[PDB]
Amino acid sequence: KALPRLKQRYREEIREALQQEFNYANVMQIPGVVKVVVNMGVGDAARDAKLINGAINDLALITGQKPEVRRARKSIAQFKLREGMPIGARVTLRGDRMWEFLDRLISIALPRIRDFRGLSPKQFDGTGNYTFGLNEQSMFHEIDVDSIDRPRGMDITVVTTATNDAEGRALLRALGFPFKEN
RNA sequence: GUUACGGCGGUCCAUAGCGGCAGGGAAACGCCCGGUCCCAUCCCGAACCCGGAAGCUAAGCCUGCCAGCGCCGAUGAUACUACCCAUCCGGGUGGAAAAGUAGGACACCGCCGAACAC
Ligand SMILES: [Mg+2]
Ligand SMILES: [Mg+2]
Ligand SMILES: [Mg+2]
Ligand SMILES: [Mg+2]
Ligand SMILES: [Mg+2]
């Protein structure tokens, strides 16, 4: 009785496109998207612990759910990092609100990147999951640019049931990701 | 009773493992569909849990076949050795490896339940 816009498009069009393109023997082999993970690595927090709270608020507004604070598992003197220090914030998106975040990202957030020339199509990890980084948080309309204290980037990974980069690239391409041509 | 069947066990727990090639879906085991309800996430119905049966044997699971990598492994011989001979080195009777070789091996056994036969 409901469906996120991008999910409907996937089930009705993209599945059929992939079956015609790669000619899978079984329908269970059709690649889909499992989860989207958004990670902010505030290494600076190892000294200025106030910074963690900004990264948390930004991710909460961007994704719509409370981040989980990730503690350092390993002391390292060069970074002034002690084990157990809160040094990262992560959000795991699944299901309906993963399809909504993806739709907002592809439609609104990515075209707002300053001097956006598309994403590199070579950022796949060999198993056909895609990761890309952002340097700032201003390209999200859920964050008030009037209120940001400091530019806070993040790493966004889309993980896929694709077995290889070619299949995963085709899926994201059909999903509307703006890839460069090389 | 017989089955490419589902469980629970066992073996001084790999001869049973890892891997490769091919195949299986009757009831089961599964992925799978969906969060109204018990319950759940240091975030996420992914997991755990609950309610379902549209799809699929592609994976898990199951069956057949490969000795490629692991694993098991003699016989004999040697090393070592207890006791006894032996003025220096050695030897006799008894026990006897490790390594290597021949080779074995792609497990085997018990209870219950399916489904079908009688
Ligand atoms: Mg059946
Ligand atoms: Mg689910
Ligand atoms: Mg198969
Ligand atoms: Mg012997
Ligand atoms: Mg031996």
Curated annotation (Swiss-Prot):
UniProt keyword Zinc, yes or no: no
GO cellular component: ribonucleoprotein complex; ribosome
Keywords for the protein's UniProt record, in alphabetical order: Ribonucleoprotein, Ribosomal protein, RNA-binding, rRNA-binding, tRNA-binding
Keyword ATP-binding (UniProt): no
Matching Gene3D superfamilies: 3.30.1440.10
Molecular function via GO: rRNA binding; structural constituent of ribosome; tRNA binding
One GO BP: translation
Family: Belongs to the universal ribosomal protein uL5 family.
PANTHER family named among the record's database cross-references: 60S RIBOSOMAL PROTEIN L11-RELATED
Subunit details: Part of the 50S ribosomal subunit; part of the 5S rRNA/L5/L18/L25 subcomplex. Contacts the 5S rRNA and the P site tRNA. Forms a bridge to the 30S subunit in the 70S ribosome.
Function: This is one of the proteins that bind and probably mediate the attachment of the 5S RNA into the large ribosomal subunit, where it forms part of the central protuberance. In the 70S ribosome it contacts protein S13 of the 30S subunit (bridge B1b), connecting the 2 subunits; this bridge is implicated in subunit movement. Contacts the P site tRNA; the 5S rRNA and some of its associated proteins might help stabilize positioning of ribosome-bound tRNAs.
Descriptive protein name: Large ribosomal subunit protein uL5
Organism: Mycolicibacterium smegmatis (strain ATCC 700084 / mc(2)155) (Mycobacterium smegmatis)
